Amino acid sequence: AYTNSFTRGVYYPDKVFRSSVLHSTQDLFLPFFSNVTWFHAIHDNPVLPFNDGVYFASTEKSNIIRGWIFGTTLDSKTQSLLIVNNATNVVI
Amino acid sequence: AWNSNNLDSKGNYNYLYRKPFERDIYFPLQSYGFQPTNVGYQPYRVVVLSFELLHAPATVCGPKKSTNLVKN
Ligand SMILES: *[C@@H]1O[C@H](CO)[C@@H](O[C@@H]2O[C@H](CO)[C@@H](O)[C@H](O)[C@H]2NC(C)=O)[C@H](O)[C@H]1NC(C)=O
Ligand SMILES: *[C@@H]1O[C@H](CO)[C@@H](O)[C@H](O)[C@H]1NC(C)=O
Ligand SMILES: *[C@@H]1O[C@H](CO)[C@@H](O)[C@H](O)[C@H]1NC(C)=O
16 A cells, blocks of 8 residues: 655754754655555564665554664574564664 | 884783674684784784764763853
8 A cells, every 4th residue: 555755754964953054964765655564453564674774664543553674684693673662662 | 093012912812813893702713822023014003093083972072171261
């Protein structure tokens, strides 16, 4: 399944304050109006590629989505990042 | 970097060798065997200190000491 990303995934490129200015920068961004892939809890979390990087989102209220997993092979034969967001905290 | 023939020679065979800051685990595997008898042949210890001069908060600083702040 797919939908339009519109403007999403703009982020502060560097930790510098600037104001009233049109700063120009070369970096990894989610391209404007690009298709996102969309997924559901009805019997859907296979190993995606990560490419140059991932924008992610969820629309929520249940808070059933509680983390992310990353690497090359994800099978102990390399170190694998686990992120959790349980109860109140990001935990890594 | 500094000579370590006094520590890292016996011989010492543990020193296997093979993008910026790449790490990796026919193949290019080769190793030393350092003996104190080895002079450019001797083991040298190295530390490369790389300094992250990004715009983020500072966290390693030199032995300097602050003044009071002065304004206007
Ligand atoms: C980072 O990971 C990629 C794969 O996730 C590595 O590139 C692949 O390396 C295997 C053998 O290790 C090859 O069979 C593939 O053909 C390679 N793929 C590509 C796209 O080149 C890459 O070497 C890894 N780099 C580091 C520093 O770990
Ligand atoms: C985006 O998704 C639509 C269907 O929702 C498809 O027709 C279109 O080709 C897709 N475009 C890209 C760039 O993935
Ligand atoms: C989240 O999980 C960690 C262990 O993974 C635990 O220490 C912690 O109490 C949990 N709750 C919060 C609010 O972090």
